[PDB]
Amino acid sequence: RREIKIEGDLVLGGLFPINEKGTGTEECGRINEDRGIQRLEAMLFAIDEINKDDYLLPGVKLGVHILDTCSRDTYALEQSLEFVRASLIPLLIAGVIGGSYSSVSIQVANLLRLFQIPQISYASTSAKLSDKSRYDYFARTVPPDFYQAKAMAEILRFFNWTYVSTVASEGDYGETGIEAFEQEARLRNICIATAEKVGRSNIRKSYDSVIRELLQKPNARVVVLFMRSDDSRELIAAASRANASFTWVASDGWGAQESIIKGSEHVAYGAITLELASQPVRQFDRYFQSLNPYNNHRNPWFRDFWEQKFQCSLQNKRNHRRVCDKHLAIDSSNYEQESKIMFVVNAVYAMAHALHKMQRTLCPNTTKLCDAMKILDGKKLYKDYLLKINFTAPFNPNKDADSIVKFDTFGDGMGRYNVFNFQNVGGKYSYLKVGHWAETLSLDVNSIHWSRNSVPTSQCSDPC
Amino acid sequence: KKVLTLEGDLVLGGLFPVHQKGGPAEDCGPVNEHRGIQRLEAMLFALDRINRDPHLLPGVRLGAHILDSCSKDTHALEQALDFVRASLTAITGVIGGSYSDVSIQVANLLRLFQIPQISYASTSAKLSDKSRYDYFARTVPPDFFQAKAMAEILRFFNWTYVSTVASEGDYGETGIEAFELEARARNICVATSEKVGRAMSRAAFEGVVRALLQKPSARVAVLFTRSEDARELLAASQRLNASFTWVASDGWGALESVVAGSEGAAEGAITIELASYPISDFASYFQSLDPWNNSRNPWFREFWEQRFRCSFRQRDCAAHSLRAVPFEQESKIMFVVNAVYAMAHALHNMHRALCPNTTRLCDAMRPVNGRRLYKDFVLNVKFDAPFRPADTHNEVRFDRFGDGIGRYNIFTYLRAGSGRYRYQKVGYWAEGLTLDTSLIPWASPSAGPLPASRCSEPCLQ
Numbered sequence: 001r002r003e004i005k006i007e008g009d010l011v012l013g014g015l016f017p018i019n020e021k022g023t024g025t026e027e028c029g030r031i032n033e034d035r036g037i038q039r040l041e042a043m044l045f046a047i048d049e050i051n052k053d054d055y056l057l058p059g060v061k062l063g064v065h066i067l068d069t070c071s072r073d074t075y076a077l078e079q080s081l082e083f084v085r086a087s088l089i090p091l092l093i094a095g096v097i098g099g100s101y102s103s104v105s106i107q108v109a110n111l112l113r114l115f116q117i118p119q120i121s122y123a124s125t126s127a128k129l130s131d132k133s134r135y136d137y138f139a140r141t142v143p144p145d146f147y148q149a150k151a152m153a154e155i156l157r158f159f160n161w162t163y164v165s166t167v168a169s170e171g172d173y174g175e176t177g178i179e180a181f182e183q184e185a186r187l188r189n190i191c192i193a194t195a196e197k198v199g200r201s202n203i204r205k206s207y208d209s210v211i212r213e214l215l216q217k218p219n220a221r222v223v224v225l226f227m228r229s230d231d232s233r234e235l236i237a238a239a240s241r242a243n244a245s246f247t248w249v250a251s252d253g254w255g256a257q258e259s260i261i262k263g264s265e266h267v268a269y270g271a272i273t274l275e276l277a278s279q280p281v282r283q284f285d286r287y288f289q290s291l292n293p294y295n296n297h298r299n300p301w302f303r304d305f306w307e308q309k310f311q312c313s314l315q316n317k318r319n320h321r322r323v324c325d326k327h328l329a330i331d332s333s334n335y336e337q338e339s340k341i342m343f344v345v346n347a348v349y350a351m352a353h354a355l356h357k358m359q360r361t362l363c364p365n366t367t368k369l370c371d372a373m374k375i376l377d378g379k380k381l382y383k384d385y386l387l388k389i390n391f392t393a394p395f396n397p398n399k400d401a402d403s404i405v406k407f408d409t410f411g412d413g414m415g416r417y418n419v420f421n422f423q424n425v426g427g428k429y430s431y432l433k434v435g436h437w438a439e440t441l442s443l444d445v446n447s448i449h450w451s452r453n454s455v456p457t458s459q460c461s462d463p464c
Numbered sequence: 465k466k467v468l469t470l471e472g473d474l475v476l477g478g479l480f481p482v483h484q485k486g487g488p489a490e491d492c493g494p495v496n497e498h499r500g501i502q503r504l505e506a507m508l509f510a511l512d513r514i515n516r517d518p519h520l521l522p523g524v525r526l527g528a529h530i531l532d533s534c535s536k537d538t539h540a541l542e543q544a545l546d547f548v549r550a551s552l553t554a555i556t557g558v559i560g561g562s563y564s565d566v567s568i569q570v571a572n573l574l575r576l577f578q579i580p581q582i583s584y585a586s587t588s589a590k591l592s593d594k595s596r597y598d599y600f601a602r603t604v605p606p607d608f609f610q611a612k613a614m615a616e617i618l619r620f621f622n623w624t625y626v627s628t629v630a631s632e633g634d635y636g637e638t639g640i641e642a643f644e645l646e647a648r649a650r651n652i653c654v655a656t657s658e659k660v661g662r663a664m665s666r667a668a669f670e671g672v673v674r675a676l677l678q679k680p681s682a683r684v685a686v687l688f689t690r691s692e693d694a695r696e697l698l699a700a701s702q703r704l705n706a707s708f709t710w711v712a713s714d715g716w717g718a719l720e721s722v723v724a725g726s727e728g729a730a731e732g733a734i735t736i737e738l739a740s741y742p743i744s745d746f747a748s749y750f751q752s753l754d755p756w757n758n759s760r761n762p763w764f765r766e767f768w769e770q771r772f773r774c775s776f777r778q779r780d781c782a783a784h785s786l787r788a789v790p791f792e793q794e795s796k797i798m799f800v801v802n803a804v805y806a807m808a809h810a811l812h813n814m815h816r817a818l819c820p821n822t823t824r825l826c827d828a829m830r831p832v833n834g835r836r837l838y839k840d841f842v843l844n845v846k847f848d849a850p851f852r853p854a855d856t857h858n859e860v861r862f863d864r865f866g867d868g869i870g871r872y873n874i875f876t877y878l879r880a881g882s883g884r885y886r887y888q889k890v891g892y893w894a895e896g897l898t899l900d901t902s903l904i905p906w907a908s909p910s911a912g913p914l915p916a917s918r919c920s921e922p923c924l925q
C-alpha cells in the first residue's frame with residue numbers, strides 16, 4: 001500500500017477515495033481522476049498555504065497522514081486503525097480531514113469516537129450523520145441529504161412530474177436519501193411508480209433487472225437516482241447497452257462530472273443533476289496545472305495517475321503504450337476543477353483555526369508548541385473551538401454571507417445547491433447551470449435542452 | 465463499568481444485554497431479567513460444565529471476560545475495546561452479540577484484529593456476507609427463513625393487505641426488505657411502511673399508531689421490532705384502544721415483558737420463536753442461586769433488587785428464594801450454551817491437531833491466532849449437543865457462512881384458565897408451514913369469521 005506520512009508538530013490525517021472499488025485484486029483497481037487526486041492535491045495545497053503564511057498558526061508546522069480509501073467502508077476501517085494506533089511509527093493525530101462516502105465516514109466516525117479524535121468531512125452528505133447521540137465527534141462542511149431531497153421534490157413538482165420511479169444504491173447514503181425523498185414526495189402528493197435498490201450484495205439486481213423493470217412501465221419516464229459515483233457509471237453504461245432512454249433527476253452522487261458520462265452520452269441526453277454550490281479556485285487551478293510526474297515526489301499515486309489521465313502508460317519502459325515523457329502537461333484544455341475543492345480546503349482550515357484559537361488560549365505566552373499542549377483531547381478541540389468556529393473563505397475574493405465558513409448546532413453547512421442540465425452544444429456534451437436552490441427554486445425552463453426536445457410528462461393516467 | 469472476569473489459560477469474551485436501553489439523559493438503566501441475566505448464567509454454567517468435563521479440555525481451563533452492552537451499539541463498541549487492547553491474557557473468542565446492530569459493530573471492530581466471534585441471538589440477513597464480516601459465526605438461523613415463514617403464515621390465512629412497522633437499525637430494515645422480496649412472488653401486499661427510531665418518544669409512537677389506524681382495511685401488522693419497541697407499540701395501542709392482529713418475529717418471541725400491562729392490545733397475536741428445548745440442569749442451576757454466595761456476578765445484585773423489589777441498604781429480601789418463584793426459561797438459552805461449545809470443541813480439536821505433546825497449555829500455542837482457528841476448526845465443527853432432552857435428532861453444525869438449520873415455532877397469545885394470558889404453540893416451521901388452527905381461539909369456525917384484511921372485498925360476480 002501507499003500513503004503520505006509528512007511529519008510535523010501537529011498532524012492532520014485524512015482519508016481519500018483515490019482508487020475505485022474492485023476492478024483488480026478484489027479490493028480496488030482504477031484511480032479516480034476527479035474525486036481521488038484533485039481533492040488530495042487540494043488538501044496538500046491548503047496544508048502548504050497554512051504552513052507558508054504567518055497570520056494563521058504561526059511557527060507550528062502542519063503535517064499530513066493521508067491514506068487511500070479504496071471506495072470501501074471495510075478498507076477505510078482497516079486503514080483508519082493507523083490513526084488510533086498511537087493512542088491504542090506512532091503519530092498522534094489531532095484531526096482526520098477525510099471521508100467522502102457516507103458509509104466510509106460513518107465507519108471512520110464510529111471507530112474514532114472511542115479514541116476522542118475530531119473528524120471533518122468534505123463530501124459526505126447523509127441524514128444518518130449529524131446525530132450527535134451516536135456521532136459526537138463528526139462535523140462536516142456540507143448539508144445533509146434532507147435538503148437535497150427537498151430540492152429534488154420541488155424540482156419534480158415544478159414540472160408537474162407525479163408518476164416517477166426511484167432507483168437507489170444500498171448503503172448509508174442511497175437508502176436514507178431515498179427514504180427522505182419518498183417522505184417529501186408523499187408530502188407533495190407525488191406517488192412513486194416503483195422502487196429499486198442497486199447493490200453488490202448476495203441478493204441484489206444485476207444492473208439489468210432494474211432497467212427491465214423500468215422499461216416494463218413506460219408510463220413513468222422520470223427516474224430519480226440516489227446512487228454513488230461507483231454505481232451510477234455502471235448503471236448508465238448498462239442503460240446505454242440496453243438502448244433505454246429516460247430523463248434523469250440525479251442527486252449529488254452523479255454531480256456535474258463528465259467521468260460518469262464516457263461513451264454513453266446518447267443514453268443520458270436529458271439529465272438534471274444537483275451539485276453543491278461551489279465556485280472555482282484560481283490558486284488551486286494554478287497549483288494543479290503546474291504539477292509534473294518528475295517534480296512531485298510526495299504523491300505516490302500521482303505517477304500512476306499520470307499514466308491514466310493522458311492514456312500514456314509505461315512511463316519508464318514497456319510495450320503497453322507509448323511513452324509520453326514530455327511535451328504534454330496538464331492544461332486548461334482537458335482539466336476541469338472539481339466541484340467540491342473549496343469544500344475540502346475549508347475542511348482543513350476549519351481545524352487550522354481550531355488549532356489557532358486553542359494555542360492562543362491554553363498557552364498564549366509563547367507562539368509555538370508548549371508542554372501544556374502535549375496531549376490533545378478531542379472533546380475540548382471539537383466542542384469548545386471547532387463547533388463554534390467562524391472564519392471567511394480563505395481563497396474567495398468576495399466577502400458575503402455565502403463566503404463564510406461556519407458550522408451549525410449539528411455540525412453541518414449551508415443548504416444551497418445548483419441544478420445542472422446535460423446539454424449538447426455544437427456537438428459537445430456538457431453540464432450547464434439552469435438554476436439554483438436556496439430554500440427556493442429558480443429553474444430556467446427556457447434554457448433547458450430535453451432528451452426529446454420537449455418538456456417530458458410523467459402521469460399515472462392520461463388526463464381525460 | 466462493571467466487568468465480569470475470571471482466571472484461566474484461555475479467556476473467552478462475552479457480550480450480553482444485561483441492562484435495558486436508557487433514556488436521553490442516562491446511558492442504560494433497568495436490568496433485563498430474561499435476555500440479559502439468564503443468558504449470562506447459562507454461559508457461566510456451560511463454562512463450569514466444560515471445565516469440569518474430563519473429555520473436553522482436561523488440562524486447559526477456559527476463562528471468561530463477560531461484558532455488558534445494555535442494548536446499545538455505541539456502548540457495545542466502547543466496551544469491546546478491552547477485547548482488543550490486550551493484544552493491539554489475550555481474548556481467544558467472543559461469545560456475544562444479542563442484537564444485529566450490537567453484533568455488527570463488534571464484528572467490524574474484531575475483524576481488524578483477527579478475533580473470531582460466535583453469536584447466540586443475532587438474526588440478520590446481512591451478517592451472512594463473508595466479504596464484509598470475515599470472522600463471524602452464528603448458531604441461530606438468519607431472517608431469510610423467518611421472513612418466508614411469516615409470508616407463508618400470512619398467505620395461509622388469506623391475508624393480502626398488510627401493514628409493516630420496523631425498528632430503525634440493521635435488524636428491522638433488512639427484515640422489511642427480505643419480507644417484501646419474498647412477498648412480491650406471492651400475493652402479499654404491504655399497505656404502509658413505518659419506522660421506529662432509536663430515540664422515540666410516546667408522541668411518536670401514538671402518531672405511528674394513528675398512521676396505522678388511518679387505513680382501516682389492514683387488520684394485521686407485521687413486526688420487526690426489539691423488545692422495548694414492541695412493548696412501547698403495544699402500550700401505545702392500548703392507550704389508543706386500538707386492536708390489531710400482530711404478526712411478530714423472534715424479537716417478540718415468547719417474552720412476558722412485552723405483554724406486561726398491554727394484554728388487551730395483544731390478543732390472538734401470532735409470533736415466531738426459534739426452535740429450542742428447555743435445559744434440565746440450567747433450570748436447577750438458576751433456581752439454586754443466591755446473591756451472597758454468587759459473588760462472581762456484579763449485576764446479579766442489581767437483578768435481585770429488581771426481582772422482588774427490595775433494597776440491601778434497608779435489610780430486605782432476607783428470606784426470599786428464587787426456587788419458590790416459578791422459573792421461565794428463555795428460548796435462546798441452549799444456543800448460548802452451543803455457542804460456548806462452539807468455542808470449546810474448536811479449542812479441543814486444535815489442541816489435538818497442533819500440539820500433540822501434553823494436555824496442558826504448551827509454549828507453542830501461546831499466541832492463538834483466530835485466522836486458522838476459524839478457517840479450519842470453527843467453521844466446520846460437528847458434535848452432539850451438550851444437554852439434549854430425551855433422544856431427539858439434532859446436531860450442532862455451522863454452514864458455509866456459519867449459520868444454523870432454519871426451524872421455527874409459532875406461538876399465539878391466548879387467555880385460558882380464567883385469563884392467564886399464556887403463549888400456546890400452534891405448530892412449527894422447518895421447510896413448510898404445518899400449523900394447526902384448532903388451538904388458535906379465533907381460528908375456530910364456531911368462534912366466528914376469520915379476520916380478513918383485503919384492499920377490495922370481492923364484489924358481485
Ligand SMILES: N[C@@H](CCC(=O)O)C(=O)O
Nearest residue numbers: 100101102123124125173
Ligand atoms: N456525496 C456523496 C458521495 C459522493 C461524493 O461527493 O464524493 C455522499 O453523500 O456520500
Ligand SMILES: N[C@@H](CCC(=O)O)C(=O)O
Nearest residue numbers: 562563564585586587635
Ligand atoms: N434476533 C434479534 C434479537 C434476538 C434476541 O436478543 O432475542 C436481533 O438480531 O436483534
